[PDB]
Each structure stands twice: as C-alpha cells, then as structure tokens.
C-alpha cells in the first residue's frame, strides 16, 4: 500500500507544496492553439511565468481539447519544464465547456476512517462546478482538507502520525479511481503530479469519496 518510511529526500515537502501550499490554476473561458498544448499569456500577474504547458499520456486523445473553450483545474510547476525560462508545466486537468455547467454547486460527501474508527467530514470542503469533472480537481481539494485537520505531508517531528493512506472515488457509472497517498513516484513535482497524465474525467452526479487513513 503506502510507505512513508521511503523518504526519497525532499519528497514530503514537495508533496505538501502540491496539495497544501498550492496556487491552483483556475480558468473557465480559455482557448488554445499551440502531445503538449501551450496557453499564451496565461499568467496575468506572475514574475516567474507567463505561459502554461499542458502534457497528456497520449497524443491521439490530445486533439479533443486542443480546439475548443476548455476549463483548467490543476497544480502547475516550474522546476524541470520542457519548453523559455518563463513557462509553467501541468499534467491533465482539462474539461470541455459544453454541458459541464450546473444550477446549484455539487456537494460531494467525504468519508474517513482512522485505523477502523469513522470520522465525520463536512461536505462543504470538496466542490465541483462541472457535470463531468477531472479526478485532479477532486483530489487537490480533498488532500488540502486532510493536511489541515491531520498533518498528512509533515514529518514525524512536525506531528505527522499518518504513515499509510488510500483515497478512492466511488463506482457511480464505471470502476473507481484507486490511489495511495504515499505511493507517488519520484521526489520532484514533475514526477509526483504525473498521475494525472491519463486525464480521467468522471461523472459528478451523486458520487462520494472514501479515504482510508492508517497510523502504522
């Protein structure tokens, strides 16, 4: 399952920057024309970056989002970017504008288990403003709520009791998305955020999230 013991350097700190100290890239009315798609002049007030790069697993499905108004939701990075010196990279988190709008904001309920014992989690934390939303948009918001309550990506010294963890997104239409919190490969953002390369977009109609936390 998940092993916190395999420190692999500054991986703990970098994972905390991805989910807790994140400046999540949020955009609704944005179109591109440049397997990677470049967004010219994406960053309005940023001294480091001006443009945004979106990488995908397969180039065959990359043309589906390429030409149309697409909604952006995900975490961007600067270190080890394949472009000059003013561009930020990102993996997936792309959804179409057509039929992906709802009247009243969806309130997805979250369930958590701490070594067997069930803990009440408020539904106001995780929210999606689209009909078919990406796994990245739900994962970033769920891990942020966890980190604030029980220090997830903090060292044993800085009160981090969680050693093993698993996050699941219920079988509402088709099989569930299973991911281990400490099982992300690599130590830098370019490898840790590589899980969203497939660009998995699932239905947000009456779905729920189940998180399994273990102290040992």
């Amino acid at each position, epitope marked *: 399952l998940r092993k916190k013991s395999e420190l692999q*350097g*500054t991986a703990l*700190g*970098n994972l*905390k*920057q991805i989910y807790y*100290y*994140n*400046e999540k890239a949020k955009t609704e009315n944005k179109e591109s024309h440049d397997h990677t798609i470049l967004f010219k002049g994406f960053f309005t007030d940023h*001294s*480091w970056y001006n443009d945004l790069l979106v990488d995908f697993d397969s180039k065959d499905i990359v043309d589906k989002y390429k030409g149309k108004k697409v909604d952006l939701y995900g975490a961007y*990075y*600067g*270190y080890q970017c394949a472009g000059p*010196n003013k561009t930020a990279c990102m993996y997936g988190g792309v959804t179409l504008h057509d039929n992906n709008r709802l009247t009243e904001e969806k309130k997805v309920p979250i369930n958590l288990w701490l070594d067997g014992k069930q803990n009440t989690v408020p539904l106001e934390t995780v929210k999606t403003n689209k009909k078919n939303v990406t796994v990245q948009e739900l994962d970033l918001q769920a891990r942020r709520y966890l980190q604030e309550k029980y220090n997830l990506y903090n*060292s*044993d*010294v*800085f009160d981090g009791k969680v050693q093993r963890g698993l996050i699941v997104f219920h079988t509402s239409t088709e099989p569930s998305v299973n991911y281990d919190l400490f099982g992300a490969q690599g130590q*830098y*953002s370019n490898t840790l955020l590589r899980i969203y390369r497939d660009n998995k977009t699932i239905n947000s109609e009456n779905m729920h999230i189940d998180i399994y936390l273990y102290t040992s």
Partner: T-cell receptor
Amino acid sequence: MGIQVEQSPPDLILQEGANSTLRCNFSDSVNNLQWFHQNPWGQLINLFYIPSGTKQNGRLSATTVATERYSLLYISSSQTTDSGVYFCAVDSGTYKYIFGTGTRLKVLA
Amino acid sequence: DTGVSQNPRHKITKRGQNVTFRCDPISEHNRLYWYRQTLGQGPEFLTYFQNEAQLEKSRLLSDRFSAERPKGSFSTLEIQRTEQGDSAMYLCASSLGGYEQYFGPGTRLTVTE
C-alpha cells in the same frame, strides 16, 4: 555532497594603502565561483562572480582557473573600509553554493 | 537597499520554544538559499529551492528544521524545539541565473534559559 575548500591565508595583517593577494583552493571541478565581503553588522556583499578568466571592476581584481583548481582576490591600495572577512562560494550539486573557512582581513591605519 | 528582505532581524526565545523566520527575495529571482552562520565562522549550507520545489537538504541539518515555500516567492524556516547551539545568524539568498547570490541582513537568534 562532498566539496572541500581551504582559503589561504587564514589571517591577514596589512598597513594602509598597501597591496595583498588572498587565494581560494578547491578539490573537485567547479562550474561557478563567487567572492563575497562580510562587514561587522553581518551582511554578505557580492564582489565578484568569476567561473573562468579574469574580471576588473573598481579597485578590486579577481582571477580564476578551472584547470589548476584555484581562485585569487587582489586588493589595490587597501583602505580601512576593506577590513572584514572575505568568503569563497564554490559550486560543484546542481547549483548548490558551499562557502569556505573565510579570509580574515584587518587593515591597520 | 540590500535587495532581499528578512523579517524579523532580531529574535529572543526560551529553551524549548517554537520560532519562525520569513525571507522576502526579489520577485524575478527563481532560486532561494538557506544558510547558518555562527561566531567567527563560515556560513553552513542548510537547504535550497528552485522555483516551487525543494531541491536538496543538508545531511548535518537537524530533524527539528523545516523550510516551507508558501503561495508566492517568500520562504519560511521553522525550528521545533530551541536547544543550545541554535543561537546563530540565519542568512537567506536569492539567484536568477543562478549566477549571482544576493544576501539579506539575516535574523539574529538568541536561545536563553
């Protein structure tokens, strides 16, 4: 992780308006070299950046050679304001700079 | 001006207390560096950042140390429990190229009984 730097001389006693040459030696091959000045208030002032060749700016001169693995710092007509500790920032990791022991300089008027 | 600001500039704390230091570098600068300097000695490397992620942490660095880079360019260095020998000048620097390192005034920490 492993980079050894020894600055010669460790202590320098010089008269007002006199010339002096302090050197910085390093073990492994180096891509980036830096020379700093520390004032009694505790602030590092970047004097020179010499990865290779020689640079001439103001009253201070600096030369560095990557072959023989050594750096040099010159002080033409040294004043009482030049008194302080001169450091040698050396880089092997990706871009990580590691400071040396430091050359203690005290200009006597 | 030095170019790189550091708040606070002087801090006094009791043995076994939590302390934090904020470093505000130049907006354009991609890199950030953390150094520790004692009385009449050279500054020892602690940890350095490149853009959004932490690149390396020193082997000699204690487990009570944690450098975090929140929303923006600034970085925060924290000490869990204050011990003897922690009383040192904590220097912060920034790099663009990263050719030249621009140093700040540095926080002077004093760990008293």
